[PDB]
């Protein structure tokens, strides 16, 4: 008969796959949108860039965070699988 | 009765498929959005492309960072599946 | 159990994934390009000739990916790699 | 300061200009009213 631990490992791996799929989608989209805004703003006024970096590097950091922390969780799916016997 | 490792490998493969699916979606969309901003700006300010390229590529690199982190983790999942008995 | 059953079911589901993604991407990208074209026409009635050339440049790319996906599904559906 | 605020109504919509507003050229609506605390706005002054 099948080893249950193998089923758990497979399920956790699929879960982490979903984790990173969502994280990658979100981080890519957020970075692209924040960029688009930054590029447009600097295009309007070159010198303005000097300040527009500030909010951008917030939102980037704020979206990348939602990835990084998310990343940690999928590690918990693989490194230390909960409910794994 | 089938080998547990075969099931684990199938789970890892599906997980990595999701990994790169989400990564591709995120990278494509974010890069396209940044490119739209670059196109609009260059159309607006004709000769500002040279200076606009560097802020463009800041976001391009930022977006690709998540994609390639997901690459690293997909390789981790597939080449050496975590806890493969 | 027959290996062919599992392999063929997996191939069917994979090809279905391929077409789902291809349809989504082609439809949305083509719609966005058409939106650009419509905006141009409305803001500039006489530009229809100038804007058509970029339009097809976009479509050719977008559709190409879709058709690529189309082709790949055949490989997944008809001649499944590792079929046995 | 450009006043600390210039309210007005434009064809696009209502616009409230602050001292460091990005340059902006727009038309006022027919019944436009302007408050201070067509329209052309330059980097230094309205």
């Amino acid at each position: 008969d099948l080893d249950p631990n193998a089923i758990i490992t497979a399920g956790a791996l699929i879960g982490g796959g979903l984790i990173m799929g969502g994280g990658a989608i979100g981080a890519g989209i957020g970075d692209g949108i924040a960029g688009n805004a930054l590029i447009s703003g600097i295009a309007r006024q070159p010198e303005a860039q000097g300040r527009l970096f500030t909010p951008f590097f917030i939102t980037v950091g704020l979206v990348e965070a939602a990835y990084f922390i998310n990343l940690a969780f999928m590690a918990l799916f693989v490194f230390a699988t909960p409910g794994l016997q | 009765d089938l080998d547990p490792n075969a099931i684990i490998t199938a789970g890892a493969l599906i997980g990595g498929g999701l990994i790169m699916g989400g990564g591709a979606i995120g990278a494509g969309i974010g890069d396209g959005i940044a490119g739209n901003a670059l196109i609009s700006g260059i159309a607006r300010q004709p000769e500002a492309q040279g200076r606009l390229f560097t802020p463009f590529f800041i976001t391009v690199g930022l977006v690709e960072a998540a994609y390639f982190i997901n690459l690293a983790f997909m390789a981790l999942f597939v080449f050496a599946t975590p806890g493969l008995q | 159990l027959d290996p062919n059953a599992i392999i063929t079911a997996g191939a069917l589901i994979g090809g279905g994934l391929i077409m789902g993604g291809g349809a989504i991407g082609a439809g949305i990208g083509d719609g966005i390009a058409g939106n650009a074209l419509i905006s141009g026409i409305a803001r500039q009635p006489e530009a229809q000739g100038r804007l058509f050339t970029p339009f097809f440049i976009t479509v050719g790319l977008v559709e190409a990916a879709y058709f690529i996906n189309l082709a790949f599904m055949a490989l997944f559906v008809f001649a499944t790699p590792g079929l046995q | 300061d450009l006043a600390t605020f210039v309210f007005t109504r434009t064809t696009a919509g209502e616009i409230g200009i602050l001292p460091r507003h990005i340059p902006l050229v727009a038309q006022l609506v027919d019944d436009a009213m302007v408050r201070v605390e067509f329209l052309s706005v330059t980097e230094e002054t309205v």
């Binding site: 309007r44 006024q45 | - | 006489e46 | 696009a12 340059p23 902006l24 050229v25 727009a26």
Partner: peptide, 24 residues
């Protein structure tokens, strides 16, 4: 400026209403 940024067939400046629109 606006004419230079418009079709002539009747530190950039943002033309909130469309540049062609303002001419009419």
């Amino acid at each position: 400026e606006l004419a230079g940024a418009s079709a002539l067939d009747h530190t950039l400046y943002s033309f909130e209403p469309d540049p062609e629109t303002l001419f009419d």
